[PDB]
Ligand binder design. Structure first.
Ligand SMILES: O=c1[nH]cnc2c1ncn2CCN(CCCCP(=O)(O)O)CCP(=O)(O)O
Ligand SMILES: O=c1[nH]cnc2c1ncn2CCN(CCCCP(=O)(O)O)CCP(=O)(O)O
Ligand SMILES: O=c1[nH]cnc2c1ncn2CCN(CCCCP(=O)(O)O)CCP(=O)(O)O
Ligand SMILES: O=c1[nH]cnc2c1ncn2CCN(CCCCP(=O)(O)O)CCP(=O)(O)O
Ligand SMILES: [Mg+2]
Ligand SMILES: [Mg+2]
Ligand SMILES: [Mg+2]
Ligand SMILES: [Mg+2]
Lengths: 169, 171, 169, 171
């Protein structure tokens, strides 16, 4: 459990990348007409959601849901609002195996939205057991032990403004 | 809420006998399955029906519950406690009219890939069906009347009635 | 894990006891005037709730909530309806240490109901770490390994019409 | 919803500076505690405020969320994920007017016996207070106007605004 944290992706680099992500997302949904909603997966994506939605120059709603912790994907907390006939962008902190988002996307698809897309801050292509389409990615990283920016290690470092790496001593 | 009266539509004795029959049918279907079985009830209206039905199901199974919402999207207010993957799942509902809600609930549970998936409802109002949903076990197919009792409510009332009654307004 | 189940409290004995419980509860709340509600603690009390509320000859509502699994008592699912200014009777399958009901009663008390009472099917006085007032008890039993009537063993025997004892082989 | 206009009440720069200040105050309070700390946000309106605030809190803490309802009873739609027993708990709210909801939420969390319990709100409308609830950290005390932005909505709108604005109808 003895460890330390070094900066891997500085605060400024994250901010710059999200600014670009915001422009990409804006470019795709600004000429839609239908209502838009960003859905965050609690509670690793709350900080990413906050910064991202501010860089999205399109009128949209902000909703959250909480999925399960091989076991099934259960919904601890569902969305507060409806998504039928809307443009839905799922906002996740990091995707590895892609199990959770795969199931979450299926569940949300049943409610028949106009479109359904996924935006992630971090991506680990190495670990991947279920191929799930991801349209917006902030950073592609190797299978490293990362924390910060909503991402935790034993419920710690969630509040770090940067993405850091954990070094096991 | 308006002035009304509750008249018996399905007496307590008729329900007990019918659930006993339903029990034998469900038992005969999943007795040679071998795989784990679970009865899933949809709160709140199905709590009484579930209690009596599972006591008539003579196979080793599990009892779980979930709460769904409502043209609105069917949202999960309370999910299952256990996994249904590779298990015989029997959804237990109090009454079907539109079939919108139950259709969606079956779709969600199907995503978790159970061995088999089926529905058992106590009451059925086929004259209100808007979506074709396959129901395998039906206690009573009833006429288009607002029923109460046996878990079913009217303004959160009459859930504790041991029989199925119908609400008749005073006009 | 190898075991077997013998009948401890037969179906008829439970039914007779609940009939008496129903009369007691009816006698206390029939001259109240205020609305009444039976609150069941999922999912061990669903069968007891079904039989009990049918023996209560007073107009009441039926609601359910799901508490936590030393850790804190968390609410996985809250009540659907309000209890403010109402007569509330908490319905539990079995009470031992009395930790959960103690916390649940505190939480419900904050919503300021007219009265707040607890009805349990089984009671284990031996195991008890928090003294919580219980007005209606179906059976007082020694610290035995019991199942059935909503009470489970590894998610099993919940559907038994009788209270049985587990014999570890 | 009616025809309206959104005018800036608290610019983005003013919020960033104020949250920075709030951060230093919170840091100085719990730095010598030693016991674990957790910031509890009340969804949904507080997600943005939480994200910026916890980044300014220079002590090792945890971030958790909960969702409460609403004269109705305050019900828990989504409870905390972690335990708060023996921990410094700081509730993080977007705005206080009546104070009914937050009063009840504090009561529920107090039952779990944390080491300490405190409240930090971004906005405050003391001219709407109906219940005396002790708030220790306040970003802005604002006049009686319907504000939007920074997590706060109007018919599920304007949550994504980086500033605090006010809705003005067209009459
Ligand atoms: O380096 C990592 N550091 C901390 N977490 C990681 C890392 N790598 C993958 N995770 C877990 C990220 N997963 C999110 C769950 C977070 C664990 P929880 O909060 O206890 O439920 C995504 C799995 P998915 O692809 O099926 O959606
Ligand atoms: O006579 C009736 N009496 C009380 N309800 C009825 C009746 N008839 C149809 N309902 C509504 C029952 N529907 C469930 C909603 C329950 C009301 P809730 O307490 O707000 O959850 C059936 C869903 P379905 O679309 O799958 O058929
Ligand atoms: O012989 C027993 N047989 C099966 N259970 C027992 C027995 N004895 C005490 N329990 C557990 C009963 N407890 C209810 C929780 C059931 C376990 P869960 O469904 O996994 O959450 C009451 C503890 P409380 O007094 O704090 O309310
Ligand atoms: O200008 C305002 N703009 C949007 N809301 C306001 C404003 N002013 C007071 N509210 C309502 C905010 N209240 C929380 C309810 C949030 C609405 P929900 O999305 O249905 O949960 C404060 C609870 P309190 O009683 O502790 O002060
Ligand atoms: Mg995540
Ligand atoms: Mg129903
Ligand atoms: Mg229990
Ligand atoms: Mg709020």
């Amino acid at each position: 459990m003895k460890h330390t944290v070094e900066v891997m992706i500085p605060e400024a680099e994250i901010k710059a990348r999200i600014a670009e992500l915001g422009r990409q997302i804006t470019e795709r949904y600004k000429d839609s007409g239908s209502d838009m909603v960003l859905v965050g997966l609690l509670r690793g994506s709350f900080m990413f959601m906050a910064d991202l939605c501010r860089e999205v120059q399109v009128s949209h709603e902000v909703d959250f849901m909480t999925a399960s912790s091989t076991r099934d994907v259960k919904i601890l907390k569902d969305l507060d609002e409806d998504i039928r006939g809307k443009d839905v962008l799922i906002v996740e902190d990091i995707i590895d195996s892609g199990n959770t988002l795969s199931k979450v996307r299926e569940i949300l698809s049943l409610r028949e939205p106009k479109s359904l897309a996924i935006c992630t801050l971090l991506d680990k292509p190495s670990r991947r057991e279920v191929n799930v389409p991801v349209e917006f990615i902030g950073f592609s990283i190797p299978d490293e032990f990362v924390v910060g920016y909503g991402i935790d290690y034993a419920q710690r470092y969630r509040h770090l403004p940067y993405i850091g790496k954990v070094i096991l001593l």
